């Protein structure tokens, strides 16, 4: 009988720094054992300071981003300013609990800049419980990415180590290294790796290829 949900793959990642923030994703869209398309990024630019990732059921991914885009314009109309990362996060927390009994099957990660230029990463559940973090993975390979981030960013189970802060050039190499490995064991992680870097100067994008198997 009619079930209103389906898992369309997806994998998302975000890392925060002292002057930047990355939000990355794969570009494959799937349906069961088949592949829909190999150009379907899960990252969406909201403001000049904020980026969001969305993974799970794709219809909800499309609906929720439009709802967010329509709420940003209303905020700007009523308050004559653009929103902050924390305000968008707290608003999404209510938009998600609006459907507490028919939820958006979506795993969300926000990444942007705090109000003094520091990085900020907010990770959500499908029903709106959010949590500021330094790094978080989400999607199908979330179980595979977070240990290596806990090790190489949090310096966990490593003694007598240099607790150096993560620079952008190191973070980007690290981000590429984790998807290069998740494309080898996870079947939903796919063709390309989109990376959206957020800085005081604006928002960039980078595309990097992965194996098509």
């Amino acid at each position: 009988r009619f079930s209103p949900y389906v898992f369309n793959g997806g994998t998302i990642l975000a890392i925060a720094g002292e002057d930047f923030a990355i939000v990355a994703s794969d570009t494959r869209l799937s349906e069961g054992f088949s592949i829909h398309t190999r150009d379907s990024p899960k990252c969406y630019k909201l403001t000049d300071k904020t980026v969001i990732g969305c993974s799970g059921f794709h219809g909800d991914c499309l609906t929720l981003t439009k709802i967010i885009e329509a709420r940003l314009k209303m905020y700007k109309h009523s308050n004559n300013k653009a929103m902050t990362t924390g305000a968008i996060a707290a608003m999404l927390s209510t938009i998600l609990y609006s459907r507490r009994f028919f939820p958006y099957y979506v795993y969300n990660i926000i990444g942007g800049l705090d109000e003094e230029g520091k990085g900020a990463v907010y990770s959500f559940d499908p029903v709106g419980s959010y949590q500021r973090d330094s790094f978080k993975a989400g999607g199908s390979a979330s179980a595979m990415l977070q240990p290596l981030l806990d090790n190489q960013v949090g310096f966990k189970n490593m003694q007598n180590v240099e607790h150096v802060p993560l620079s952008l050039d190191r973070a980007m190499r690290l981000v590429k290294d984790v998807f290069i490995s998740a494309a080898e064991r996870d079947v939903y992680t796919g063709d390309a790796l989109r990376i959206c870097i957020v800085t005081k100067e604006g928002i960039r994008e980078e595309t990097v290829s992965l194996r098509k198997d």
Partner: protein, 225 residues
Amino acid sequence: YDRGVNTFSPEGRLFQVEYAIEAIKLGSTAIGIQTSEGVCLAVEKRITSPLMEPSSIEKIVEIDAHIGCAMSGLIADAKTLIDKARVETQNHWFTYNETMTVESVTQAVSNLALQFMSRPFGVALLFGGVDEKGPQLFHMDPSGTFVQCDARAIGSASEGAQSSLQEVYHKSMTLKEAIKSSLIILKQVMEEKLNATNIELATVQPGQNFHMFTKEELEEVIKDI
């Protein structure tokens, strides 16, 4: 043409809306002054008997820890609009987890005046608070018209008080001096001896919340008059 809010004059006027303005001059006078150090609010209470406890006359109130209101006109309209402002400031916190600006509180409170309830609100309000944009003073009118002001006087003696503020005001003042100027203007539009129960006074600074003055702090400024 005079009675009914759905009837235009031949010149395109709404006399009931103007008669709602005229209901403000029947209220005691209130003054609000901007300053880069903060905002002040100063009012007359108009005690009618020594038996009434004057603390039960709410003419200055807290909307939040960073916004304070002063009113003149009908009590019921004021209760309604103050409850509206208080509720909106907290719905904003619940959703966005931040402080609503004075401009947006005023914008949201003025939208009820845009509803013909079957009668215009017979009350004008001054909103004093501190925002990301610093201290701000706003003025809402029964027409739902709101605007930023550097100094404004509403109520019975609004004309003379405004005709004095335009002389004693400059965009370099301090808060202790503006508080003195406001009470000097208030002294001149009263046929009663200014004292520490015939007036209220409040301030909202950046690093400090809304604070209504006490009898001690009031008398310690009444003395230097």
